[PDB]
Design a protein around this motif. Structure first.
Motif, PDB file in Angstrom:
ATOM      1  N   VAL A  12       0.800  -1.195   0.082  1.00  0.00           N
ATOM      2  CA  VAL A  12       0.100   0.155   0.115  1.00  0.00           C
ATOM      3  C   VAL A  12       0.924   1.256   0.156  1.00  0.00           C
ATOM      4  O   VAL A  12       0.690   2.184  -1.002  1.00  0.00           O
ATOM      5  N   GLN A  13       1.707   1.507   0.885  1.00  0.00           N
ATOM      6  CA  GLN A  13       2.664   2.613   1.090  1.00  0.00           C
ATOM      7  C   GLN A  13       3.150   2.796  -0.169  1.00  0.00           C
ATOM      8  O   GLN A  13       3.460   3.878  -0.834  1.00  0.00           O
ATOM      9  N   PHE A  14       3.908   1.560  -0.745  1.00  0.00           N
ATOM     10  CA  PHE A  14       4.413   1.607  -2.007  1.00  0.00           C
ATOM     11  C   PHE A  14       3.628   2.465  -3.060  1.00  0.00           C
ATOM     12  O   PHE A  14       4.030   3.542  -3.678  1.00  0.00           O
ATOM     13  N   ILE A  15       2.554   1.818  -3.448  1.00  0.00           N
ATOM     14  CA  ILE A  15       1.823   2.583  -4.298  1.00  0.00           C
ATOM     15  C   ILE A  15       1.186   4.017  -4.072  1.00  0.00           C
ATOM     16  O   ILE A  15       1.172   4.762  -4.848  1.00  0.00           O
ATOM     17  N   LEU A  16       0.924   4.279  -2.696  1.00  0.00           N
ATOM     18  CA  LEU A  16       0.452   5.437  -2.210  1.00  0.00           C
ATOM     19  C   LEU A  16       1.681   6.443  -2.595  1.00  0.00           C
ATOM     20  O   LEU A  16       1.433   7.347  -3.289  1.00  0.00           O
ATOM     21  N   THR A  32      -5.462   8.413  -0.197  1.00  0.00           N
ATOM     22  CA  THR A  32      -5.371   7.131   0.533  1.00  0.00           C
ATOM     23  C   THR A  32      -5.309   5.976  -0.177  1.00  0.00           C
ATOM     24  O   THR A  32      -6.134   5.708  -1.271  1.00  0.00           O
ATOM     25  N   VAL A  33      -4.684   4.957   0.523  1.00  0.00           N
ATOM     26  CA  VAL A  33      -4.638   3.499  -0.307  1.00  0.00           C
ATOM     27  C   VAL A  33      -4.992   2.585   0.655  1.00  0.00           C
ATOM     28  O   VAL A  33      -4.395   2.650   1.986  1.00  0.00           O
ATOM     29  N   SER A  34      -5.620   1.438   0.391  1.00  0.00           N
ATOM     30  CA  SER A  34      -5.847   0.542   1.374  1.00  0.00           C
ATOM     31  C   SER A  34      -5.881  -0.956   0.556  1.00  0.00           C
ATOM     32  O   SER A  34      -5.977  -1.182  -0.535  1.00  0.00           O
ATOM     33  N   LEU A  35      -6.286  -1.910   1.257  1.00  0.00           N
ATOM     34  CA  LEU A  35      -6.741  -3.378   0.801  1.00  0.00           C
ATOM     35  C   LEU A  35      -7.981  -3.693   0.328  1.00  0.00           C
ATOM     36  O   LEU A  35      -8.731  -3.015   0.904  1.00  0.00           O
ATOM     37  N   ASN A  36      -8.018  -4.498  -0.730  1.00  0.00           N
ATOM     38  CA  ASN A  36      -9.277  -4.801  -1.122  1.00  0.00           C
ATOM     39  C   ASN A  36     -10.233  -5.670  -0.431  1.00  0.00           C
ATOM     40  O   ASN A  36     -11.258  -6.320  -1.004  1.00  0.00           O
ATOM     41  N   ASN A  37     -10.172  -5.570   0.846  1.00  0.00           N
ATOM     42  CA  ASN A  37     -10.990  -6.262   1.781  1.00  0.00           C
ATOM     43  C   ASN A  37     -10.836  -7.908   1.791  1.00  0.00           C
ATOM     44  O   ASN A  37     -11.223  -8.686   2.588  1.00  0.00           O
TER      45      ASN A  37
END
Length: 440
Positions: A375-379, A405-410
């Motif tokens: 996530v951090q990388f992509i952000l 903001t970036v997060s995981l696909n659940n």
């Protein structure tokens, strides 16, 4: 080098001035793959790929598109009978593609001067050689982008002064063909798609608008569509109202003008709108619209062209789209193409830039993990992109803090990217959320 500079490159590509956009344009030609696209960027491409000169009457719309578009992906709507002929002794020579262009093909087989045992089989296209093969037997003949030799038992290559192919024909365009065009359009990368369909059939126009709605709001590919007189009330379609008249006196109906408008929207920069853009080559807007009619038209989301008798040139009244029915969700701002080009673009790049990094980090065997580090990388990457757009002056008031903001696909199998961007001139931050899956 690497992902990083690619993300900045992306945004940088979005403000760069000069040759732009690539537009998918359906046309009818007498030579070509048939049911397939053809990419053309230079005039030569036209003739080499479609058998005729770009100046031919067959490419009227094509030229109009090329007036502002850098690339045009022409799709052959029709098809046709393949020209044939029997060379020397039982050597069936058939044209590669179907169409009247095959009737200009002619094979002249002579004897080889540097080896009397071989023959000089050459193929012509309008009295100009395009393929010469020095073979000994009929079998040694390799198919070219012009002919197809059929070697049989009784095959004997006899010298010929010049046997020409015949029987070439092209069947008129059927409304079915336009449907197939939209189907092949799914597997092509273009910015804008033109639908120069005659104002007659309303069904088609409708099925076209649907196609665009899907591509955008369903497949995530934010493209633009251009049709004449078709209030799709959708921000993804441009509703061309009137047509124009060229210097040579040729009259272009609105359903034809779409070709130009397509290239116009496809080439437009993220910083510049298309209002007051002149339609090079047009001496008058036919029909013309009075102030009240024009003001009326714009109110209804219509792309209108007006003739300025002062400078004696026709230009775009306002770069708008068919969207009229606004709301809380998507404000009125969405009708103005400038604001939309920024937004659409952003999103589009967000998803492709992420996918590239995914399938690139995979090629180095360092797949981007579906954890916090991923996530951090992509952000961090998208952020570079976003900031770049701000510096180039495409978007303002971008706060690296509470704007991205970036997060995981659940299902921790993809990334979700939420962002609130604000296009230059428009006091309003828009909320956009794109989801990218690690394995598509």
């Amino acid at each position: 080098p690497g992902i990083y500079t690619n993300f900045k490159a992306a945004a940088a590509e979005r403000t760069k001035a000069g040759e732009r956009g690539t537009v998918a344009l359906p046309l009818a030609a007498s030579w070509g793959a048939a049911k397939e696209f053809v990419e053309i960027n230079k005039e030569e491409d036209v003739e080499k790929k479609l058998g005729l000169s770009l100046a031919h009457q067959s490419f009227l719309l094509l030229r109009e598109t090329l007036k502002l578009a850098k690339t045009v992906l022409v799709y052959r709507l029709n098809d046709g009978i393949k020209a044939t002929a029997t060379l020397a002794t039982d050597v069936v020579v058939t044209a590669k593609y179907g169409g009247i262009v095959g009737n200009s093909i002619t094979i002249k087989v002579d004897e080889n001067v540097v080896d009397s045992s071989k023959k000089d089989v050459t193929t012509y296209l309008n009295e100009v050689a395009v393929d010469k093969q020095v073979v000994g037997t009929a079998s040694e003949l390799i198919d070219s982008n012009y002919v197809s030799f059929k070697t049989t038992s009784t095959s004997e290559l006899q010298q010929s002064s010049g046997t020409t192919l015949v029987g070439g024909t092209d069947q008129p365009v059927t409304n079915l063909d336009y449907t197939q065009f939209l189907v092949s359009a799914e597997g092509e990368y273009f910015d804008t798609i033109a639908f120069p369909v005659s104002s007659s059939d309303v069904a088609l126009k409708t099925s076209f608008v649907s196609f665009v709605k899907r591509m955008r709001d369903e497949q995530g590919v934010k493209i633009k569509g251009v049709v004449a007189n078709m209030p799709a009330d959708y921000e993804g379609i441009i509703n061309v109202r009137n047509g124009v008249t060229l210097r040579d006196g040729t009259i272009l109906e609105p359903h034809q003008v779409v070709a130009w408008v397509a290239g116009a929207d496809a080439s437009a920069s993220m910083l510049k709108s298309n209002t007051f853009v002149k339609y090079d080559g047009a001496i008058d807007a036919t029909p013309r619209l009075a102030n009240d009619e024009a003001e009326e038209a714009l109110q209804n989301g219509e792309f209108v062209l007006t003739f300025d008798a002062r400078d004696k040139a026709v230009y775009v009244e306002q770069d708008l789209n068919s969207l009229t029915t606004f709301s809380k969700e998507k404000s009125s701002k969405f009708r103005k193409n400038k604001i939309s080009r920024i937004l659409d673009g952003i999103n589009n790049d967000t998803r492709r830039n992420i996918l590239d990094a995914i399938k690139e980090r995979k090629d180095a065997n360092t797949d981007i993990p579906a954890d916090e580090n991923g996530v951090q990388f992509i952000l961090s990457m998208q952020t570079a992109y976003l900031n770049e757009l701000q510096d180039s002056g495409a978007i303002t008031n971008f706060d690296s803090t509470a704007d991205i903001t970036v997060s995981l696909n659940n299902n921790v199998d993809g990334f979700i990217v939420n962002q609130s961007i604000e296009p230059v001139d428009s006091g309003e931050k828009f909320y956009f959320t794109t989801e990218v899956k690690l394995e598509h």
